[PDB]
Amino acid sequence: LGTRAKESLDLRAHLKQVKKEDIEKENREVGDWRKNIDALSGMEGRKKKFEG
Amino acid sequence: YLMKILTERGYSFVTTAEREIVRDIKEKLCYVALDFENEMATAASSSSLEKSYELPDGQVITIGNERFRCPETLFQPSFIGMESAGIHETTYNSIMKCDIDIRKDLYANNVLSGGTTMYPGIADRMQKEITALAPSTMKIKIIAPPERKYSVWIGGSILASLSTFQQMWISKQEYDEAGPSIVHRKCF
Numbered sequence: 075l076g077t078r079a080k081e082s083l084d085l086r087a088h089l090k091q092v093k094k095e096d097i098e099k100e101n102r103e104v105g106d107w108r109k110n111i112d113a114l115s116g117m118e119g120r121k122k123k124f125e126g
Numbered sequence: 127y128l129m130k131i132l133t134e135r136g137y138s139f140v141t142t143a144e145r146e147i148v149r150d151i152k153e154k155l156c157y158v159a160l161d162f163e164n165e166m167a168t169a170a171s172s173s174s175l176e177k178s179y180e181l182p183d184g185q186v187i188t189i190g191n192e193r194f195r196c197p198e199t200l201f202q203p204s205f206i207g208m209e210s211a212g213i214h215e216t217t218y219n220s221i222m223k224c225d226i227d228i229r230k231d232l233y234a235n236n237v238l239s240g241g242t243t244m245y246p247g248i249a250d251r252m253q254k255e256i257t258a259l260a261p262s263t264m265k266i267k268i269i270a271p272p273e274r275k276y277s278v279w280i281g282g283s284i285l286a287s288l289s290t291f292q293q294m295w296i297s298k299q300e301y302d303e304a305g306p307s308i309v310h311r312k313c314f
Contacts, residue, residue, distance in 0.1 A: 125288055 127206050128152050128196040137187055151179055151189070152196060157246040159194040160254065162201075166191060197245045201255065214255035233264045239277040243270070 129139050129148040139148050155177055159165040169175045169191035178188045199205045201212035210216070221232050236256070238249065249270040257266045271277060285291055296313045304311065 124284075125290055 127199055128156070128192065131192050131195060132189075134192075135187075135190070147182065151187075155179060155189055156193050156196045158197045158200075158248040158251050160247060160251055162194070162198055165194050169194075197248070200242075200248075201251070212255075214252055215259065217252075218256060218259045230264055233260060234267050235269065236267065237269045239274055241275050244274055 128151065129145065132139065132148065132151075139145065175193060176188050176190050177193065178186045180186045195205075201214050203210050203212060211219070217236065221229055224232060233256075236252075238252075249268050253266055253268045256268075260266055273280065294313060296308055300313070301308050
């Protein structure tokens with residue numbers, strides 16, 4: 075009984091390792107970028123050129 | 127139409143020269159009413175609207191409720207017998223023919239131009255009408271720059287001043303090779 079139980083335990087151990095430890099390879103992607111504001115400072119242009 | 131409704135007070139303008147005088151009256155006095163029925167009721171009781179104007183020879187005239195009835199024809203073309211709907215409803219129809227995903231942007235960036243859109247109080251009447259027609263969630267904004275009359279020409283100057291546009295002209299040698307029908311071709 076112990077042998078059969080430990081067989082399944084060891085079999086699932088490696089699967090759990092691969093599933094979980096490999097998550098630590100990267101988890102910062104949740105972090106978003108700046109997305110800064112202007113605060114009425116980027117108003118320094120007239121209606122001179124618009125195509126470029 | 128203004129020259130035709132002025133006859134209801136006694137002033138008759140017939141000559142093709144007097145059409146210019148009626149045009150001057152229209153430019154200087156007429157305005158678009160925010161709500162038509164209320165203005166018709168007010169002008170028929172008080173006398174706070176009657177503005178006078180001096181003809182090129184004297185004999186001042188007094189315009190009553192002809193002031194906002196002349197430019198009202200824009201929103202009710204049935205006045206001059208035209209069947210179609212006003213400029214407040216042909217814009218909404220023009221929008222609804224567009225695709226379903228660009229209607230919000232068109233609602234938010236409605237632009238006015240041309241001379242006749244210079245009537246005092248039209249940018250509010252048109253917005254009220256479209257807001258009545260349009261769905262309640264969309265925001266309706268009407269761009270009415272102060273330089274409305276020359277808007278087309280200013281845009282023409284900007285377009286002619288572009289470097290990218292410099293090769294779209296219909297060069298004379300091209301016309302010599304294909305005749306006047308070149309304009310419908312690639313050089314639009």
